[PDB]
């Protein structure tokens, strides 16, 4: 053998980071995605007139 | 008070005296619609102005929608022929509307800086053309 180490140990840290960010984003997206209170028409826009 | 003060609806004149009323109505709705169309064109969100507006009614009066709204009531007090109510709405609407104009103006002067400063230097007259 003659080949020493290759790309890095820090690039593995970066790819672990992006893996964890995507996993956490999926985890957050799965459970807090749907919540609805109301969508009422805003047809008394008083800040234009009153 | 305007309905109380004004003469009875059959005693108020017609003919060529009711043609000025139509003129006031149409000029009011032109000024207000122009002011609204100029104000709402530059805002990305519902009320978030991206830039400083200085066109049309904005090159005459710094707060044109407000002036147009009061001019609507002024023409209304002219319609039933009650000038005293016209003066009283002048007082009260001017007071409240100047308060809100001061709050809005200080906000957007803080948020914009020199642009609205030189714009207000260009048009000092805040509500009525060269009256106030």
B80-87's contacts with Cβ under 8 Å and 24+ in sequence apart are: B80/B2, B80/B3, B80/B5, B80/B6, B80/B7, B80/B9, B80/B12, B81/B6, B81/B7, B81/B12, B82/B1, B82/B2, B82/B3, B82/B4, B82/B5, B82/B6, B84/B1, B84/B5, B85/B1, B85/B2, B85/B5, B85/B6, B86/B2
Q: Give which of B111, B107, B115, B96 is closest to B58, Cα–Cα.
A: B115
For residues A15 and A21, what is the distance between their CA atoms, to the nearest angstrom? 10
Q: Are B77 and B89 in contact (CB under 8 A)?
A: yes
B70, two tokens: 């009061």
Q: Are B57 and B38 in contact (CB under 8 A)?
A: yes
For residues B115 and B113, what is the distance between their CA atoms, to the nearest angstrom? 6
A contacts of B47 (beta carbons < 8 Å) = 47
For residues B85 and B68, what is the distance between their CA atoms, to the nearest angstrom? 17
Q: Are B122 and B92 in contact (CB under 8 A)?
A: no
For residues B42 and B32, what is the distance between their CA atoms, to the nearest angstrom? 16
> Bridge-partner residues for B43, per DSSP?
B49
Distance from CA of A23 to the nearest CA of B (A): 33
How far, rounded to the nearest angstrom, does the alpha carbon of residue B20 sit from its chain's CA centroid?
Answer: 18
Q: Are B58 and B64 in contact (CB under 8 A)?
A: yes
B75, two tokens: 């023409």
What determination technique applies here?
cryo-EM
Exposure string for B28-42, b = 16+ CB within 10 A, e = fewer = beebbebbbebbeee
What one-character DSSP code corresponds to residue B58? G
Tokens 């400063």 label which residue?
B117
> Bridge-partner residues for B49, per DSSP?
B43
Can you tell me whether residue B49 is helix, strand or coil? Answer: strand
How far, rounded to the nearest angstrom, does the alpha carbon of residue A37 sit from its chain's CA centroid?
Answer: 23
Preferred mutation among B39, B41, B45, B46 to probe A, highest tally of A CBs within 10 A: B46
Hey, are the CB atoms on B69 and A49 less than 8 Å from each other? yes
Q: What are phi and psi of A16, to 5 degrees?
A: -65, -40
| Phi-psi category of residue B113: left, alpha or beta, with phi > 0 → left and psi -120 to 50 → alpha | left
């Amino acid at each position: 053998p003659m080949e020493t180490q290759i790309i890095s140990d820090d690039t593995w840290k970066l790819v672990d980071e992006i893996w964890d960010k995507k996993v956490e984003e999926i985890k957050a997206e799965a459970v807090i995605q749907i919540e609805e209170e109301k969508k009422k028409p805003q047809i008394l826009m008083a800040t234009h007139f009153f | 008070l305007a309905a109380f003060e004004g003469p009875e609806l059959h005693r108020l004149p017609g003919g060529w005296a009711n043609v000025g009323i139509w003129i006031l109505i149409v000029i009011t709705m032109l000024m207000h619609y122009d002011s609204t169309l100029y104000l709402a064109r530059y805002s990305e969100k519902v009320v978030v102005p991206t830039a400083v507006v200085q066109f049309g009614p904005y090159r005459w009066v710094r707060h044109p929608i407000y002036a147009s709204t009061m001019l609507l009531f002024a023409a209304y007090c002219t319609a039933l022929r009650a000038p005293l109510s016209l003066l009283f709405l002048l007082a009260v609407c001017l007071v409240y509307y100047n308060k809100k104009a001061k709050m809005e103006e200080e906000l957007m002067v803080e948020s914009f800086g020199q642009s609205y400063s030189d714009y207000a230097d260009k048009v000092r007259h805040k509500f009525i053309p060269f009256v106030y």
